[PDB]
Amino acid sequence: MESADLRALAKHLYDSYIKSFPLTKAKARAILTGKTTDKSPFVIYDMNSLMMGEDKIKFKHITPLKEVAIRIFQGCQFRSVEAVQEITEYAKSIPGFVNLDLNDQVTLLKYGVHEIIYTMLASLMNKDGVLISEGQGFMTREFLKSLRKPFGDFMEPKFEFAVKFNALELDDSDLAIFIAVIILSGDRPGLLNVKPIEDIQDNLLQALELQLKLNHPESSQLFAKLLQKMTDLRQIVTEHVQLLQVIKKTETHPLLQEIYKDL
Amino acid sequence: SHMESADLRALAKHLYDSYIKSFPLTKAKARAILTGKTTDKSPFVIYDMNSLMMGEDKIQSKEVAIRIFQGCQFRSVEAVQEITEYAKSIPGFVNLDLNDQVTLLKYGVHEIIYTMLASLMNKDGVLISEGQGFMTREFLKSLRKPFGDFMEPKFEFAVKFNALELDDSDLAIFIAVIILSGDRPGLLNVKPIEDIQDNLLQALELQLKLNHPESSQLFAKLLQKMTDLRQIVTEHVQLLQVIKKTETDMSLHPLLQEIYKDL
Ligand SMILES: CC[C@@H](NC(=O)c1ccc2c(c1)c(C)c(C)n2Cc1ccc(F)cc1F)c1ccccc1
Secondary structure (H helix, E strand, C coil): CCHHHHHHHHHHHHHHHHHHCCCCHHHHHHHHHCCCCCCCCEEECCHHHHHHHHHHCCCCCCCCCCCHHHHHHHHHHHHHHHHHHHHHHHHHHCCCCCCCCHHHHHHHHHCCHHHHHHHHHHHHEECCEEEECCCCEEEEHHHHHCCCCCCCCCCHHHHHHHHHHHHHCCCHHHHHHHHHHHHCCCCCCCCCCHHHHHHHHHHHHHHHHHHHHHHCCCCCCHHHHHHHHHHHHHHHHHHHHHHHHHCCCCCCCHHHHHHCCCC | CCHHHHHHHHHHHHHHHHHHHHCCCCHHHHHHHHCCCCCCCCCEEECCHHHHHHCCCCCCCCCHHHHHHHHHHHHHHHHHHHHHHHHCCCCCCCCCCHHHHHHHHHHHHHHHHHHHHHHHECCCEEEEHHHCEEEEHHHHHCCCCCHHHCCHHHHHHHHHHHCCCCCHHHHHHHHHHHHCCCCCCCCCCHHHHHHHHHHHHHHHHHHHHHHCCCCCCHHHHHHHCHHHHHHHHHHHHHHHHHHHHHCCCCCCCHHHHHHHCCC
């Protein structure tokens, strides 16, 4: 509607984005390049550095367990569950979300967290590795693909997406509106009242379009390129669940399986 | 109406919202079925062997006492899945050590099932089959030994617990307090667990004061009910040790077995 109101929505989403996500992209980019404050993350590049990292980095997912490739997949599921709760808190700050049907709120989050997890995973990724444990570590890309089959292929697609996605050079204020657009997708299966969802998303898309033009004046059709990335996000989520269904045939704890019943 | 009350009320609203999304049969719906004030919510009442056989196909050639006991396990296992889903929504729960998350769910899931079971109970019986059925207290008490002495401690607690007249918004915070118990055996980090419960205990005190202003010291009486919950769990595990050695042709559900392992 009003151009000034769209900037108010952009400022609101960014303020909530900071409160909901501790390790922002700006903080992650400072770690991946050097914030002139030392505190460089512990790098995991092989099996020996991984065993040293577990004795130094405070890992809160070390259950009595036997192969190494399972532990790494276990750690990435612990963080995923933490991420879902961060996204859920952020989704509640989107204007109009809490007023939606309660079943629709659950549906929008059920199918949206995966696409948001990979979107924000790109903020912690360069072409050589990904930050882990709130930025205290850095697991190299070569060490991830050196894992045995099929555990050596569940991160390479995210790297291929991140290197293309990070080329857009979006900051946290851009991602805050972009993440809100993904959550309010009116085409999620099982929605009961699509109209208010699309109404809010069309309002978020107007805010994102004005945000990208003011924050990236020299990027011609960046708004269009960012919408094309949403298509690539659903391709990986579909590709990941196919690899996830291969899992459950190899990892064969009852109470632990209920906490991680998804993803 | 200070700023501290704002966060406590926000925490109460968050938990109640997660409570509704995690449990499909709330106390409000349970009471609307039992009070019998409509026509579409009337349940089928099972009171003898005849009405038991009459109420079939409610959306094996086993013994009646065995078949009903097997049905209690499936609902218990399904309840563990719902409590596990609600636990992840408690702020800070998924950020704790993974072994502590399992330990809190291991010892907390019993005290919550019997707490919410009171919502489905009155003086004369308990709702079953998602509220479509209603099994009387005397029919369950008439089952062969020792299957007839399973539900009596639960009915006695429910009658005294329901006298507090708590609604779902009160139960949402009280259930969160039960999960974040820092006295569970085998915990690694008690300080982060006690910090979360102190916040939940603070939110429960304000919730009960605003929702039950005429009820004097309801917060103290609600906390004292933990003694009765512990007594039921102790009596329940003693009975299961009898069936384990008398009914060697059946076993508990694997998810239930892991909960009962050790303590
Ligand atoms: C803590 C786990 C504990 N579970 C119970 O003690 C229990 C018993 C009966 C319950 C319930 C919980 C609940 C939630 C309901 C609604 N019921 C009534 C009910 C519902 C459906 C039906 F088919 C028959 C019914 F009796 C348990 C552990 C191990 C083995 C068996 C049970």
